[PDB]
Write a protein that binds this DNA or RNA. Structure first.
Ligand code: NA
Ligand code: NA
Ligand code: NA
Length: 320
DNA sequence: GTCGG
DNA sequence: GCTGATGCGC
DNA sequence: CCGACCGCGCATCAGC
């Protein structure tokens, strides 16, 4: 209903992140765009929007200007500035953030073609981002997410049957498509109390030509690129993350990385109401002075809901 | 840019 | 070479 | 009025 407005706000967000290097303004604009996107009426004025949380005085003014004129002069200015628009474009390459993009543009590197000419000036991450520029911007239909899941769960199984693997994100909530694949991994041998555990899994996924490129990889986190097996149309390359988490912190991690972010907000709020604090890693009781005690045992997501006396919420009912 | 202490 | 800072994506 | 707004793992750099 307010597609024009939320587009305007997103454009402003991208400009603050990429050109102004103002990450909190970026997120303020995103917050505004989200809350307006969800508003079940066609906004008729700035004052109306300002009733919404995340929408303040300045955004209300831009909404008035947009509604009267169908544009923002601030945005037209920005779009007609070659430097700003080139900086903004270059950050669409994974690995090229606001700093690299400004540096590149400063020396006349402004397009994909320019990057290709200057690949010697890119780091490994950036080269991969450039290589799969188009594929990385594609969404992943749920039916492919399911084929990808089966591959990952099976190959993990082949390395060792005690591995536990869970594909999280909006996917786990029943999303009809995903931006990437986020995999949480654990193993009985890994706990916060006390060895190539992730490597063995990455190596096997490479072995079967599922994982095709690595952006980064250490003992607990892998970020890379994967592709489904193809005499017909070859699949786009996709971003996959794999995180190795201690088993005693595993289901808190699943909970967190399943979201939604709004769901996590309401659940941490409710946990506090009842004398617990939940973060990505643990659920801890609060003493009366507000001192967090030791992390509680967690053997499943359900355990966390139990502790705070909340009725178990199916992942697909976790929109908020 | 918006919010809350 | 070593340590701590920064950039980056999440 | 003023600081918070998540903060972490990894790659790379800055400074030594
Ligand atoms: Na508001
Ligand atoms: Na980028
Ligand atoms: Na605050």
């Amino acid at each position: 209903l307010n597609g024009g407005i939320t587009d305007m706000l997103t454009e402003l967000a991208n400009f603050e992140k990429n050109v102004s290097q103002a990450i909190h303004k970026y997120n303020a604009y995103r917050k505004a765009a989200s809350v307006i996107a969800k508003y079940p009426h066609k906004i008729k004025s700035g004052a109306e929007a300002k009733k919404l949380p995340g929408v303040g005085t300045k955004i209300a003014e831009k909404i008035d200007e947009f509604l009267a004129t169908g544009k923002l002069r601030k945005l037209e200015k920005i779009r007609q500035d070659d430097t700003s628009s080139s900086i903004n474009f270059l950050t669409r390459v994974s690995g090229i953030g606001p700093s690299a993009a400004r540096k590149f543009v400063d020396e006349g590197i402004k397009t994909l073609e320019d990057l290709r000419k200057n690949e010697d000036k890119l780091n490994h991450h950036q080269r991969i981002g450039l290589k799969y520029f188009g594929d990385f911007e594609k969404r992943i239909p749920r039916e492919e997410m399911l084929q990808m899941q089966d591959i990952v769960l099976n190959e993990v199984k082949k390395v060792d049957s005690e591995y536990i693997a869970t594909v999280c994100g909006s996917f786990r909530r029943g999303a009809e498509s995903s931006g990437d694949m986020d995999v949480l991994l654990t193993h009985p041998s890994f706990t916060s109390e006390s060895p190539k555990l992730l490597h063995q899994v990455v190596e096997q996924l490479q072995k079967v030509h599922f994982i095709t490129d690595t952006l980064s990889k250490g003992e607990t986190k892998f970020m890379g690129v994967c592709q489904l097996p193809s005499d017909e149309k070859e699949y786009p390359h996709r971003r996959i993350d794999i995180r190795l988490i201690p088993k005693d912190q595993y289901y808190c991690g699943v909970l967190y990385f399943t979201g939604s972010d709004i769901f996590n907000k309401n659940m941490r709020a409710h946990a506090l109401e009842k004398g617990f604090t939940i973060n990505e890693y643990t659920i801890r009781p609060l003493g009366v002075t507000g001192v967090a005690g030791e992390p509680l045992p967690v053997d499943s997501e359900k355990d966390i809901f139990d502790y705070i006396q909340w009725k178990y919420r199916e992942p697909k009912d976790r929109s908020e």
